[PDB]
Structure 1
Amino acid sequence: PDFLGHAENPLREEEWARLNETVIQVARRSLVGRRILDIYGPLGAGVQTVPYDEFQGVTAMVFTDARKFKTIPIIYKDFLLHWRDIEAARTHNMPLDVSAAAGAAALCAQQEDELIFYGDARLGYEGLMTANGRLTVPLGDWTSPGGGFQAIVEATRKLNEQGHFGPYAVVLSPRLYSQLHRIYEKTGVLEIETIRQLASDGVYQSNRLRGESGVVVSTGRENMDLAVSMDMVAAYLGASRMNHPFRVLEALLLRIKHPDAICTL
């Protein structure tokens, strides 16, 4: 009967394909970090450590590669399919409900963006909001109509003088996004279109930022990367008590190879 037995992929190939498509699609729709960072290609699930810097190195002599090494975190969320649903979908209703997968993937991607913007801060992971040498600037009197473009211009000037010209990118909190998206306030048209023309790559909004945020970054690779050990895939754990629990995995590591292209408002 094949269901009075333990395990080894209760779902068929079509159902696995549908599940993976759903999880990948909702991840791609939700994630905002993966739209300004070039990704070090998918290395495979085997790797656990990746270099964090750039290779600039030159009786017996000993040579120790002194760049840096950091371990790759792993993000997961659990979800459960009832016993009878799979057995039905194998003969009964051809669709298999994958609502739980969508919910789990949404939570996982939200945690991913939170991890990129804020590091764990005690495990040693760093982030676009906590990187050392962050080029911090003050962003005060934002409520004044026309006081947000000034901070963006001074920030991009500070990055230009440090040697980092080229296309920029801006990630703003929802409140600041609305404030800059509502008013004209300086000379001409809405004071988010001028910033969008200044950034030349895009101005995005991230829900994970706190009340006041808004870093501008230099989108070029070799400034900041994103090591993808493996993209979001759904994995089967094992039939606990004749049900079927799964897990959606992801293993990303932000590496700030050059923390000069960061400027926090």
Structure 2
Amino acid sequence: MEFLKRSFAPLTEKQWQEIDNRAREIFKTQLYGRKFVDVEGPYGWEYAAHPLGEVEVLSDENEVVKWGLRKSLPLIELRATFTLDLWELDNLERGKPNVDLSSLEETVRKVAEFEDEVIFRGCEKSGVKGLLSFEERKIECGSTPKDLLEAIVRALSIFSKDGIEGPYTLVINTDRWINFLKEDDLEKRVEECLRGGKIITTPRIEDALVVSERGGDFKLILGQDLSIGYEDREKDAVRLFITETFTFQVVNPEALILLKF
């Protein structure tokens, strides 16, 4: 809302709409992590920590009054700035349909990459642990297209043993998917051996993983969703920024399996 000083920027309503639409379009396809995780609704710009429901005991064993500190996860706040050209933006009022927004597009891609890196690999200073860090959930087979089907069947067996149900999803690297596709018609067979679930191809990881989408196993906590605001003006250009505040945690590590090729 008001903390994004959007009413003090020398832009009209149509120019603001153009910027918003381009950013939204790129985010919707480049945020790969949000395709299979839960999103806990925005809490506000003031939210600072998320409880973990635990106490760390700081007193000795011989005291009468024993005390400790409660534990939580601190939220991460990011900010990335870029510049736009005022004359080029003003051509939009004359009626140009294709204005130049290359700086905005480049910054949006970098922000999305940062967030996906946090989800998949974690941040040691914040204390989050990523999906690929769970090395006790890893199974191994070969690189032949038949080995992929064997691995999927074994993964579903392990899920049933642990009691996990629901739709299943395969998240795989694009280069590996193309190599598998060349050898044979993997699709329509992968889905059948995965009981009608989706396939998601990403460049973020270099192998595959299988997840259950019943709900409540991977949480992305948001304080303020991605927003665009105003900073200052530099003699012919406008400086704007993209901001967000979030954190991530894995509740049930039993709904995830890592395939190693």
TM range (shorter): 0.7 to 0.9
Asked whether 1:24 is paired with 2:21, we answer no
- CA deviation after TM superposition for structure 1 residue 256, in Å: 0.8
1:233 aligned to which of 227, 231, 238:
227
SS of residue paired to 2:132: coil
Distance 1:203 1:91 in 2: 43
2:140 aligned to which of 134, 138, 159:
138
Count of aligned pairs between the two proteins? 242
CA contact (8 A) 1:119 1:125 kept: yes
CA contact (8 A) 1:27 1:232 kept: no
For 1:56-205, what aligned pairs fall within 5 Å after superposition? 68-86=71-89, 88-89=90-91, 92=94, 97-131=100-134, 134-139=136-141, 141-142=142-143, 144-184=144-184, 190-197=185-192, 198=194, 200-205=196-201
Asked whether 1:207 is paired with 2:207, we answer no
Asked whether 1:43 is paired with 2:39, we answer no
Aligned residue type for 2:44: G
- The residue number in structure 2 matching 1:261 is 255
Distance 2:183 2:67 in 1: 59
- The residue number in structure 2 matching 1:58 is none
Distance 2:168 2:225 in 1: 26
SS of residue paired to 1:14: helix
- CA deviation after TM superposition for structure 1 residue 23, in Å: 0.8
Range with bigger deviation, 118-127 or 19-28: 118-127
- CA deviation after TM superposition for structure 1 residue 254, in Å: 2.1
SS of residue paired to 1:238: strand
Distance 1:17 1:108, change over 3 A: same
- The residue number in structure 1 matching 2:13 is 13
Distance 1:45 1:192 in 2: 44
Distance 1:192 1:75, change over 3 A: farther
Range with bigger deviation, 154-163 or 116-125: 116-125
Structure 1 runs not aligned, ≥5 long: 1-6, 55-60, 185-189
Distance 2:200 2:162 in 1: 24
Structure 2 runs not aligned, ≥5 long: 1-6, 55-64
- The residue number in structure 2 matching 1:217 is 211
Distance 2:94 2:253 in 1: 56
Aligned residue type for 2:107: A
CA contact (8 A) 2:76 2:126 kept: no
Aligned residue type for 2:34: R
Q: Deviations over 1:194-226 (max 9, x none)?
A: 22231533110111113xx21111112221122
Aligned residue type for 1:192: E
CA contact (8 A) 1:72 1:252 kept: yes
Distance 2:126 2:137 in 1: 23
Range with bigger deviation, 104-113 or 194-203: 194-203
CA contact (8 A) 2:73 2:126 kept: no
CA RMSD in angstroms comes to 2.9
- CA deviation after TM superposition for structure 1 residue 52, in Å: 4.9
